[PDB]
Amino acid sequence: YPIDKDTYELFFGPQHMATENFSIILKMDGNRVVKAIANPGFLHRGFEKLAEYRPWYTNIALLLRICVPEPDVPEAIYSMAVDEIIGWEVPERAQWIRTLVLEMARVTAYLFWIMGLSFKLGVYTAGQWAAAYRERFMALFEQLTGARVYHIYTIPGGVRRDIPGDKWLRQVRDTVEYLKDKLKDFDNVLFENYITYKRLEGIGVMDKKFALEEGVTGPNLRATGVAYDVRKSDPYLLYPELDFEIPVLKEGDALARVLVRRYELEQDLYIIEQLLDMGPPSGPYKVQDPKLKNLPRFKVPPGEAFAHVEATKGDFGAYVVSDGGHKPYRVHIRGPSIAHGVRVLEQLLVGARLADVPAILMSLDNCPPDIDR
């Protein structure tokens, strides 16, 4: 006997192609939502009690898969944290390499978010273009380090493979100037039409006091009135000698949290163009010769370190503690989307129509491998 008789519970499970892999059970009322709780954790590999059993250097390759769209931001934060507890002397060349791959993976993640938004917003042309122009960035990464995604690159000191040379650094100038001439054809399909602007207007109204104390750390609370950019507040890599300008709006409906990410794509591509004309000087790619050998037996002195870094969706931190041996005692990777599309999504879908459940789901850039950890 069906014991609700009032509210039908359709729910977007995994096989839906709008939500990626996290089920949101929606207590629908005709065509609105009156209660939207989420069941995440269809992907819980475990990384607390799973990355505690590997040595310190080889715990990179196992830690990449905590966030799929950015295959460099999870390694470049753990590489920043093990940098601190040992206290290396990571040179200028390794700092520049890690800077440029941390920004080119970010423009890859923005392009993937555009393609993921357009696959569920109906319009396929902004999806196919976004994946096509992400593919040349993948084929440019493949010259450098290894595979397309999950390029195990940034070991705790420095990097693993340096630049090929003028065949590569001239090529990045070509694709960045190409995509900066190309980006004016994304506006006319995704941000200038009177469909999308009339589709995402006023849905999911996020207040100003509802973002800073809620768990939101990304660029989407920056569309609400909040002045917080971790690249600007505490620059970590070769950021202070860049002088980029960050966007802040006083709005907070859903399309405010989309135009801010479009402008972040524009200024980040201007960063990669500005970083390239600097060019890296000489130096080694590794950090030190004597305190790296016998690579499993890598006793680190005890203590702890926190690091945190800007992402496509949320400034998400790592937490490593070292007992004093060749094992991370606990490496916690705080997912960006833990209270960023699970808890704030519960008070965002209440009242919204069914057509703007997937669009709201992508207007926060919900990536399901981050809630589980």
């Binding site: 250097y57 390759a61 200038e192 002045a227 966007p247 802040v248 402008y263 499993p296």
Partner: protein, 176 residues
């Protein structure tokens, strides 16, 4: 600090401006016809393993840095890498002291459901004469072992190569 707009980012919606996304009705479509236009992958793409049988000392230094615990050791004391649990991270390359564990660009490896084609994933990697199976034999970039005939109680695996040597050797004992 350095807030960029006041209303500079927010643009104006527009009726018939999406017709400028219609420009690619006549340009050349950007795709690769994979049967048969090849891609030529990178000169140092991470792929399969090319252990050298004359420099390997069996010190199991790779055994303790594999993140997925598949470089388990055999006797005649070389390792067999299984690609069942292996992420191609190539931490076993720059940690092997002698240098007897390389990596070459070979990634295409498709096997079917039967177990006799699934013994294909347990190979003691062969010498770098397998680079003469990447070139000089039909440059297809595929795994040049292509069937393995294990035999119980007469343990003599046979890497039946593309047309080369059958590469027989006995395997007795595992671990250390």
């Amino acid at each position: 600090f350095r807030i960029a707009p006041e209303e500079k980012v927010k643009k104006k919606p527009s009726f018939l401006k999406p017709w400028f996304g219609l420009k690619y009705l006549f340009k050349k479509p950007v795709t690769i016809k994979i049967p048969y236009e090849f891609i030529e992958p990178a000169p140092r793409y991470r792929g399969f393993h090319t252990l050298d049988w004359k420099k390997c000392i069996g010190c199991n230094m790779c055994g303790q840095i594999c993140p997925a615990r598949a470089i388990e050791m055999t006797w005649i004391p070389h390792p067999k890498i299984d690609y069942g649990r292996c992420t191609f991270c190539q931490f076993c390359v720059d940690v092997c002291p002698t240098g007897a564990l390389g990596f070459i660009e070979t990634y295409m490896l498709t096997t079917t459901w039967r177990e006799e084609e699934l013994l294909l994933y347990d190979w003691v990697p062969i010498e770098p004469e397998k680079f003469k199976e990447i070139q000089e034999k039909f440059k297809d970039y595929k795994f040049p072992v292509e069937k393995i005939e294990f035999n119980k109680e007469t343990k003599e695996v046979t890497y039946y190569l593309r047309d080369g040597t059958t590469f027989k050797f006995k395997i007795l004992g595992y671990g250390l």
